[PDB]
Amino acid sequence: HARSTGSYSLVTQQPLGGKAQFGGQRFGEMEVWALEAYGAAYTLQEMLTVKSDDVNGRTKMYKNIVDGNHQMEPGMPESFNVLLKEIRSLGINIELEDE
Amino acid sequence: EEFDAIKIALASPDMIRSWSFGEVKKPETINYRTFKPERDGLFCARIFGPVKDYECLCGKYKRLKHRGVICEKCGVEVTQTKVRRERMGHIELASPTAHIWFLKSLPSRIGLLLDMPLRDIERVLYFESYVVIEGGMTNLERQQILTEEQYLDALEEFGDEFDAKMGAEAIQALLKSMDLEQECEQLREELNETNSETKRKKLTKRIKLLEAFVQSGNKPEWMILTVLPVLPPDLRPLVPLDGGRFATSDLNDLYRRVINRNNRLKRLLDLAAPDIIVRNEKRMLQEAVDALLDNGRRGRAITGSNKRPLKSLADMIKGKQGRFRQNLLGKRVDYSGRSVITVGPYLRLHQCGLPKKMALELFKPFIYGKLELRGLATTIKAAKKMVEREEAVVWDILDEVIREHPVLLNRAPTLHRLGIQAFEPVLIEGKAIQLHPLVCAAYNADFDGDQMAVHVPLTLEAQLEARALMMSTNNILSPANGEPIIVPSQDVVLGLYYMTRDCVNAKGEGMVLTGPKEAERLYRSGLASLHARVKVRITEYEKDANGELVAKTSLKDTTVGRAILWMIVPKGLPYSIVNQALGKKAISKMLNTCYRILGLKPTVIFADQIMYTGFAYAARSGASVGIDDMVIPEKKHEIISEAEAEVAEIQEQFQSGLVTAGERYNKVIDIWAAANDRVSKAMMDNLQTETVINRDGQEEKQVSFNSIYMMADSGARGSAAQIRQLAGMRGLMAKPDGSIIETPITANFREGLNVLQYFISTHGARKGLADTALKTANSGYLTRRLVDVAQDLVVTEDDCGTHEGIMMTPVIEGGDVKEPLRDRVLGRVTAEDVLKPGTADILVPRNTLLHEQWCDLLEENSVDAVKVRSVVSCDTDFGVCAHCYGRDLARGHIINKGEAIGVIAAQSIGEPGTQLSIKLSNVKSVVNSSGKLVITSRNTELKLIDEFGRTKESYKVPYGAVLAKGDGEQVAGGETVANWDPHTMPVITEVSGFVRFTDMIDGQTITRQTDELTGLSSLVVLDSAERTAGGKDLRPALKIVDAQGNDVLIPGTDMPAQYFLPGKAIVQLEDGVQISSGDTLARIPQGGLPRVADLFEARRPKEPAILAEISGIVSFGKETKGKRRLVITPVDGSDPYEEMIPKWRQLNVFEGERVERGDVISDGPEAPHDILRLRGVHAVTRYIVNEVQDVYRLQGVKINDKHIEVIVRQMLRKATIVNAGSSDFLEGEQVEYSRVKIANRELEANGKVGATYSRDLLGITKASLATESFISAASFQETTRVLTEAAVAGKRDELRGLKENVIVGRLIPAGTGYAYHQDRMRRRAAG
Amino acid sequence: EIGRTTDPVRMYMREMGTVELLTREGEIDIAKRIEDGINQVQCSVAEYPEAITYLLEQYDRVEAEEARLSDLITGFELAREKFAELRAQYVVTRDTIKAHATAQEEILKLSEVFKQFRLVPKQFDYLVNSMRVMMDRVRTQERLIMKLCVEQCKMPKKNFITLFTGNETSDTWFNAAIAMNKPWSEKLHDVSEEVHRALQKLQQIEEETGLTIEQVKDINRRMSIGEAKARRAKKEMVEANLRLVISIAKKYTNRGLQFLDLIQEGNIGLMKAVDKFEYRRGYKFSTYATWWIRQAITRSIADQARTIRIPVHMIETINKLNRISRQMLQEMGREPTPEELAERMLMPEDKIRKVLKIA
RNA sequence: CGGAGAGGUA
DNA sequence: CTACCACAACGAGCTACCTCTCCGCATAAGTGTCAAATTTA
DNA sequence: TAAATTTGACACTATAATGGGTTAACTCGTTGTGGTAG
Ligand SMILES: [Mg+2]
Ligand SMILES: [Zn+2]
Ligand SMILES: [Zn+2]
Q: Does B512 contact chain A (CB < 8 Å)?
A: no
Cβ-based contacts of C2 with chain B (< 8 Å): 123, 128-129, 147-148
| Count of CB atoms situated within 10 Å of the CB of B214 | 12
CB of B130 within 8 A of CB of B166?
Answer: yes
**Is the minimum distance from the CB of B338 to strand E below 7 Å?**
yes
Q: Give the residue from chain C lying closest to B29, CA to CA.
A: C308
Q: Does C69 contact chain B (CB < 8 Å)?
A: no
Distance CA B117, CA A47 (A): 50
What separation in Å is there between the alpha carbon of B1167 and the centre of ligand 1? 42
Q: How far is CA B397 from the centre of its chain?
A: 49
Distance CA C206, CA B1173 (A): 88
Chain D bases near protein Cβ (<7 Å) = 1-2, 4, 9-10
Cβ contact (<8 Å) for A34 and B1311? no
The CA-atom distances, in angstroms, between B441 and each of B418, B495, B715, B1060 are: 10, 18, 15, 65
Q: How is chain A split into domains, by residue range? A: 14-99
Torsion of CA B1206, B786, B104, B6, to 10 degrees: 70
DSSP H or E run through B421: strand B420-428
Starting at the edge strand that comes first in sequence, how are the strands of the sheet with B224-230 ordered?
Answer: B20-23, B88-98, B224-230
Cβ-based contacts of A47 with chain B (< 8 Å): 331, 333, 455
SS3 B312: coil
**Is the minimum distance from the CB of B106 to strand F below 7 Å?**
yes
**C-alpha closest to that of B714 among B532, B560, B530, B490:** B490
Distance CA C260, CA C248 (A): 12
Cβ-based contacts of A93 with chain B (< 8 Å): 8-12, 15, 1287
**Is the minimum distance from the CB of B204 to strand F below 7 Å?**
no
What separation in Å is there between the alpha carbon of B879 and the centre of ligand 3? 10
For residue A57, the distance in angstroms to the closest alpha carbon of chain B comes to 12
Q: Does B1292 contact chain A (CB < 8 Å)?
A: yes
List CB contacts of B430: < 8 A, sequence separation 6 or more.
B355
The ligand with the least distance to the CA atom of B50 is 2
- Is residue C347 left, alpha or beta, with left meaning phi > 0 and alpha meaning psi from -120 to 50? alpha
CB pairs under 8 A between A and B: 301
In the DSSP assignment, the letter for residue B577 is G
Question: Which residue is closest, via its CA, to the C1' of E28?
Answer: C319
The CA-atom distances, in angstroms, between B1122 and each of B43, B991, B1261, C48, C202 are: 73, 32, 37, 92, 89
| Strand E neighbours among B 1126-1165, CB < 7 A | 1140
Distance CA C343, CA B516 (A): 103
List CB contacts of B919: < 8 A, sequence separation 6 or more.
B942, B943, B944, B945, B951, B967
Report, in angstroms and rounded to the nearest whole number, the Rg of chain A calculated over CA atoms.
Answer: 15
How many helices (H) and strands (E) chain B has is answered by 43, 42
- In chain B, the largest separation of any two C-alpha atoms, in whole Å, equals 126
**C-alpha closest to that of B401 among A70, C321, C246:** A70
In the DSSP assignment, the letter for residue B921 is E
List CB contacts of B542: < 8 A, sequence separation 6 or more.
B549, B550, B551, B552, B572, B574
The ligand with the least distance to the CA atom of B340 is 1
**C-alpha closest to that of B167 among B256, B278, B13, B293:** B278
Neighbours of ion ligand 1 (CB under 5 A): B 446, 448, 450
Q: DSSP labels for B1135-1172? A: ----EEE-SSS--SS-TTSEE-SS-BSS-SPPPHHHHH
Q: How far is CA C191 from the centre of its chain?
A: 41
CB of B138 within 8 A of CB of B332?
Answer: no
* Cβ-nearest to B5 among A36, A41, A97: A97
For residue A64, the distance in angstroms to the closest alpha carbon of chain B comes to 9
The CA-atom distances, in angstroms, between B1263 and each of B598, B791, B1186, B1230, B1271 are: 45, 12, 22, 11, 14
For residue B231, the distance in angstroms to the closest alpha carbon of chain C comes to 17
What separation in Å is there between the alpha carbon of B24 and the centre of ligand 2? 20
Distance CA C86, CA C83 (A): 5
List CB contacts of B588: < 8 A, sequence separation 6 or more.
B483, B484, B487
For B375, phi and psi rounded to 5 degrees? 95, 10
Cβ contact (<8 Å) for A33 and B1292? no
List CB contacts of A50: < 8 A, sequence separation 6 or more.
A57, A58, A60, A61, A72, A73, A74, B458
Distance CA B1221, CA B260 (A): 58
List CB contacts of C280: < 8 A, sequence separation 6 or more.
none
- The domain made up of B918-985 has a fold known as OB fold (Dihydrolipoamide Acetyltransferase, E2P) (2.40.50)
Distance CA B1176, CA B888 (A): 28
What separation in Å is there between the alpha carbon of B351 and the centre of ligand 1? 21
Cβ contact (<8 Å) for C12 and B276? yes
The identity of residue B831, as a single letter, is A
CB of B470 within 8 A of CB of A38?
Answer: yes
Distance CA B1273, CA B1281 (A): 10
Do the chains C and A touch each other, judged by at least 3 C-beta pairs below 8 angstroms? no
Residue B1153 CA neighbour count, 13 Å, CB half? 20
* Cβ-nearest to C264 among B280, B298, B299: B280
Cβ contact (<8 Å) for B274 and C235? yes
| Count of CB atoms situated within 10 Å of the CB of C157 | 11
Cβ-based contacts of B459 with chain A (< 8 Å): 42, 46, 70-72
CA angle A86, A89, A91 (to 5 degrees): 125
Q: Does B410 contact chain A (CB < 8 Å)?
A: yes
Residue B1185 CA neighbour count, 13 Å, CB half? 26
What separation in Å is there between the alpha carbon of B895 and the centre of ligand 3? 13
Distance CA B957, CA B940 (A): 7
SS3 B1282: helix
CA angle B1155, B1158, B1162 (to 5 degrees): 75
What separation in Å is there between the alpha carbon of B607 and the centre of ligand 1? 24
Which stretches within B510-600 are classed as H helix? 516-525, 560-566, 584-597
Distance CA B1210, CA B1272 (A): 15
| Count of CB atoms situated within 10 Å of the CB of B1101 | 12
SS3 B213: helix
B1225, exposed or middle or buried, with CB in 10 Å at 0-12, 13-18, 19+?
middle
Distance CA B1192, CA C302 (A): 69
For residue B280, the distance in angstroms to the closest alpha carbon of chain C comes to 7
B1260, exposed or middle or buried, with CB in 10 Å at 0-12, 13-18, 19+?
buried
The CA-atom distances, in angstroms, between B469 and each of A37, A40, B422, B484 are: 11, 8, 9, 17
Distance CA C222, CA C230 (A): 12
Neighbours of ion ligand 3 (CB under 5 A): B 871, 873-874, 884
Specify the resolution in Å. 3.8
Could you tell me the distance in Å between the CA of residue C223 and the C1' of nucleotide F30? 64
For B978, phi and psi rounded to 5 degrees? -80, 100
CB of B749 within 8 A of CB of B731?
Answer: no
Method: cryo-EM
- The domain made up of B635-768 has a fold known as Topoisomerase I; Chain A, domain 4 (1.10.132)
Torsion of CA B1222, B1225, B1228, B1234, to 10 degrees: -100
Chain F bases near protein Cβ (<7 Å) = 7-10, 12-21, 29-34
Of all nucleotides in the shown strands, which has a C1' nearest the CA of B239? D2
Cβ-based contacts of B247 with chain C (< 8 Å): none
Distance CA B425, CA B355 (A): 9
In the DSSP assignment, the letter for residue B818 is S
B191, exposed or middle or buried, with CB in 10 Å at 0-12, 13-18, 19+?
middle
- For β-strands B420-428 and B351-355, DSSP reports them as parallel
SS3 B37: strand
B1272, exposed or middle or buried, with CB in 10 Å at 0-12, 13-18, 19+?
buried
Distance CA B885, CA B872 (A): 9
- Which of 919-948 (B) contact A at CB < 8 A? none
Torsion of CA C157, C158, C159, C164, to 10 degrees: 80
CB of B920 within 8 A of CB of B967?
Answer: yes
Distance CA B436, CA B424 (A): 12
CB of B945 within 8 A of CB of B951?
Answer: yes
CB pairs under 8 A between B and C: 62
Q: Give the residue from chain A lying closest to B899, CA to CA.
A: A39
Distance CA B476, CA B483 (A): 8
* Cβ-nearest to B369 among A67, A76, A85: A67
Q: Give the residue from chain A lying closest to B335, CA to CA.
A: A4
**C-alpha closest to that of B1310 among A11, C148, A42:** A42
Residue B130 CA neighbour count, 13 Å, CB half? 18
- Is residue C210 left, alpha or beta, with left meaning phi > 0 and alpha meaning psi from -120 to 50? left
Q: List chains adjacent to chain B, taking adjacency as at least 3 C-beta pairs closer than 8 Å.
A: A, C
**Is the minimum distance from the CB of C120 to strand F below 7 Å?**
no
Distance CA B671, CA B1213 (A): 55
**C-alpha closest to that of B363 among B333, B399, B393:** B399
